[PDB]
Design a protein around this ligand. Structure first.
Ligand SMILES: [Zn+2]
Ligand SMILES: [Zn+2]
Lengths: 201, 201
DNA sequence: GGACAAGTCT
DNA sequence: AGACTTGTCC
């Protein structure tokens, strides 16, 4: 019963926040994150490991959801899905358990469930929260983005926001992280150009 | 029974040759033809009228066939079709009587038949030959191209040639014209840029 | 990693 | 029409 998913950040009572693994500063990296602009640059299909920080262990059954939304307040009501060209292309959507209409996927997990809202048609992927591996404190989730930010008919060059929520079994929103996501072929140069464009402006 | 349609020219015993009309020299023209390079520049979907020079009246039932082929000797055997993106797009392929997979269409003609080679898969559109309208010497066919020369999944930035053949009822190739075809959003500037890149090379 | 290429915004 | 943008070649 939520048409326009709320993008506004909300650190849950468990200090909800997401960070990233020092993506290779080189222009060759398959992904990179800009904390200044708070935007994630990722190559299509290429795996993107996300660090999730949890300060208070949540009630078991609690899960994390990833949902793509549109940043353009004019397209914010439109559902984000894979490109119509990519929705069919046998390259990746032919052997994966993930539906070919979902933009975001999760690599390396079977408990991951892909859901299509019946009333809102919103695509999203959820995974039950896992305890940080022995020794470390952050948990890691591997996400895939099966569409460039420029694909024709899908997200026609219009930016998006990735909504990572921390829900419980019934669906109560506890923590909510958000960041703009740009999927391109050269995440490095695009990040650089966006930061330099950020200063002199 | 022709896998790799022959591209080279072959005037028939009816002096087979194609020409064009005004070619609004301005860069705004939806289409423009270069006789120097012998290449056609056209905007996607926009109508391109082709003048067919018929010399000796051919046998009744004779038809003309437009077929797109790849100029790259590497992709030549690959069948040219609309990009998977455009094959779905509700833009044009939703109310037209032409298959959503065919690159070349004919506008303003119900006698036009769109055929897929069952053994080769080649797309092509055939229209029965019409007598030059009263008074004039040129018969005209209105062709449409529903895929840029840069679309994704289809003819991705690799050039093509348009094969216009004059066949009879059974299919004997009487006349065969050919010219490279570029579908872009700025046919004027691309024509100029190619014609200048021609001498400085 | 630089530069060409080509669709689109303004 | 000029120029930006962004995927892709080299
Ligand atoms: Zn796509
Ligand atoms: Zn197309």
């Amino acid at each position: 019963h939520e048409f326009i998913p709320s993008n506004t950040d909300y650190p849950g009572p468990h200090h909800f926040e997401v960070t990233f693994q020092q993506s290779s500063t080189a222009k060759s990296a398959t992904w990179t994150y800009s904390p200044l602009l708070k935007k994630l640059y990722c190559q299509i299909a290429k795996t993107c490991p996300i660090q999730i920080k949890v300060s208070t262990p949540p009630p078991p059954g609690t899960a994390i959801r990833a949902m793509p939304v549109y940043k353009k307040a004019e397209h914010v009501t439109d559902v984000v899905k894979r490109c119509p060209n990519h929705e069919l292309g046998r390259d990746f959507n032919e052997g994966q358990s993930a539906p070919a209409s979902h933009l975001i996927r999760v690599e390396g997990n079977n408990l991951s469930q892909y859901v299509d809202d019946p009333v809102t048609g919103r695509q999203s992927v959820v995974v039950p929260y896992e305890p940080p591996q022995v020794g470390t404190e952050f948990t890691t989730i591997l996400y895939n983005f099966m569409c460039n930010s420029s694909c024709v008919g899908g997200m026609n060059r219009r930016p998006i926001l990735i909504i990572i929520t921390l829900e419980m079994r019934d669906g109560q929103v506890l923590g909510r992280r958000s960041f703009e996501g740009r999927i391109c072929a050269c995440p490095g140069r695009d990040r650089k150009a966006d930061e330099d464009h950020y200063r002199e402006q």
